[PDB]
């Protein structure tokens, strides 16, 4: 909650350093690579439920997913507080719109990162991020026309 507000509006927090990546590593990815916020919240909630029905496998990535979900929820409840206290629902919709526009992509990177760590393995993700960054930084005539693909686990 103090962390939440720091990471979204305060630019002093790299939430990825503790997991072995960086903000710059995730920023190489094109926005179309990530699913929408709402789909990632669905995936997240399903992974979290698997953490609770088997606390054996509770991971720090589960905890991070949970912090992100409760964050998004706080912004949504603030959006409804505006517009219940004003007249219109259109005030609520305006706040939601501002949140999606300004922080939507930050949420999509964070959620995709912990989900994919729980899905492909963290080392697979870290390696994929390095590969994608190398591709992006390479002059075009020296790189394949297609960026590195993240293949699903066998």
């Amino acid at each position, epitope marked *: 909650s103090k962390l939440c507000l720091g990471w979204l509006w305060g630019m002093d927090i790299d939430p990825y350093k503790e997991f072995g990546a960086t903000v710059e590593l995730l920023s190489f990815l*094109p926005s179309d690579f990530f699913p929408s*916020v709402r789909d*990632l919240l*669905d995936t997240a909630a399903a992974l979290y439920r698997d953490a609770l029905e088997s606390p054996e496998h509770a991971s720090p990535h589960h905890t991070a997913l949970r912090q992100a979900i409760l964050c998004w929820g706080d912004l949504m409840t603030l959006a409804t507080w505006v517009g219940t206290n004003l007249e219109d629902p259109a005030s609520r919709d305006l706040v939601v719109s501002y949140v999606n526009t300004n922080v939507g992509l930050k949420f999509r990177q964070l959620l995709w990162f912990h989900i*994919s760590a729980l899905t492909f393995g963290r080392e697979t993700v870290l390696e994929y991020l390095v590969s994608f960054g190398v591709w992006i930084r390479t002059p075009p005539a020296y790189r394949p*026309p*297609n960026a590195p693909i993240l293949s699903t686990l066998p």
Partner: single-chain antibody, 231 residues
Framework: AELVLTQTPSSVSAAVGGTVTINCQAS??????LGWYQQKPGQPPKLLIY???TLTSGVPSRFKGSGSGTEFTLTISGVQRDDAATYYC??????????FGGGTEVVVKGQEQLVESGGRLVPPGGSLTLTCTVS????????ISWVRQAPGKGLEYIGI?????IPYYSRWAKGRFTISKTSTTVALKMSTLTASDTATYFC?????????????????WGLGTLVTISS
């Protein structure tokens, strides 16, 4: 949370030069995330309008999409013989809750490539894997969707896999169907097959809007692979 698209009417007869009106009602607000598709006999579906109003390139201006929220309309004003076809709406509330409408038969009187493979005859209860081989399409920034059509029936949405390789499935498919991704291919594995699974299976490339939803904008399409369950 289950999305249902009620499309009316189910068939329309018009003279060349008449006007054809198709309505789509969604059971929950999908905002603008809706396509209109056109399918002629023996051919894969073709994207006409995405985003409820945006015409795809080459589509004559006699097609007009409109609506938002729960109510959408497709109008063909100058209707022509070349527009005889079945028309489907495709709504996406989320990439799990994405559904086609039931289709409207319209009778008029007077380097990107995807190749499906793996269609076979399969015993009831068997399993199968289909392959979509992708060319000219960067699988890191595009989504690949799977759709099926049973013989003489409508399009049914199965699932989608995004550039970042998170799959999504419709509620009816989840747990019998698995989408997977290679550097060159997308695959669909199907288990516990019955006669209701007999169908043509298509893959199609999803293009994302700025919020990240691709499952309603599908173009291009492969020609499909036929799966038949037989005792």
């Amino acid at each position: 949370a289950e999305l249902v698209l009620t499309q009316t009417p189910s068939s329309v007869s018009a003279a060349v030069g008449g006007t054809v009106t198709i309505n789509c009602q969604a059971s929950q607000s999908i905002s603008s995330r809706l396509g209109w598709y056109q399918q002629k006999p023996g051919q894969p579906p073709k994207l006409l309008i995405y985003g409820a109003s945006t015409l795809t390139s080459g589509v004559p201006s006699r097609f007009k999409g409109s609506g938002s929220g729960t109510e959408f309309t497709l109008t063909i004003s100058g209707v022509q013989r070349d527009d005889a076809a079945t028309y489907y709406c495709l709504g996406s509330d989320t990439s799990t809750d994405t559904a086609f409408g039931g289709g409207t038969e319209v009778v008029v009187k007077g380097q990107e490539q995807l190749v499906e493979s793996g269609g076979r005859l399969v015993p009831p209860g068997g399993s199968l894997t289909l392959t979509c081989t992708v060319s000219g399409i960067d699988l890191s920034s595009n989504a690949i969707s799977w759709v099926r059509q049973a013989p003489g029936k409508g399009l049914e949405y199965i699932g989608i896999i995004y550039g970042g390789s998170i799959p999504y499935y419709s509620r009816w498919a989840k747990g019998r169907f698995t989408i997977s991704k290679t550097s060159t291919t997308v695959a669909l594995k199907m288990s516990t097959l019955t006669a209701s699974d007999t169908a043509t299976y298509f893959c199609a490339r999803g293009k994302s809007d700025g919020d990240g939803y691709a499952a309603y904008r599908l173009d291009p399409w492969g020609l499909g692979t036929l799966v038949t369950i037989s005792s």
